[PDB]
Symmetry: C2
């Protein structure tokens, strides 16, 4: 029948310096796209974009199941200054950009 397997977890990330370039984010202000390039796969991460009046104007969850480029579509946004906030249990990422 069904039995618990006693496991031990070694969180190597807690003793391993992280690559400053694990994530590279770009904005294309012509096509109104955000491009997120992950060097390795990663846990799902929530992406929020906030305007100058603190309105959340875009929210999505990205599933980086493989290394490579993930695109987010910001076509519905006005021009202006935006804050990018990405988060999950492991990391919080902040940046700013203009459309």
């Amino acid at each position: 029948g069904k039995q618990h397997v006693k496991t031990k977890s070694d969180w190597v990330i807690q003793r391993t310096p992280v690559d400053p370039e694990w994530l590279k984010v770009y904005v294309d202000d012509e096509s109104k796209r955000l491009c997120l390039n992950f060097k390795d796969s990663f846990a799902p991460i929530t992406v929020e974009v906030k305007d100058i009046e603190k309105q959340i104007v875009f929210q999505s969850i990205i599933f980086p199941v493989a290394a490579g480029e993930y695109t987010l579509y910001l076509g519905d946004l006005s021009l202006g200054q935006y804050e990018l906030y990405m988060y999950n249990a492991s990391v919080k990422v902040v940046g700013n950009f203009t459309l």
Copy 2:
């Protein structure tokens, strides 16, 4: 055009103890199933099972895109004693079980 957005990452996980029950592993020796229950979503993780001669008898990548239970079928395996090893860039997990 396309412009780099400077981002600052805060790796919360590097300074935060992780719930020892983040992952619960079970084995059903009748159905020859391994069951992996994640409390939260997680990065893709490689699952390897080794026999007493250290032959790798099962190897697969799991994609824990949502919290919940993931099942792996071990029908190819003999009755016997096995070592479990699961790993990605962030964690290594070890346990042992019987079929």
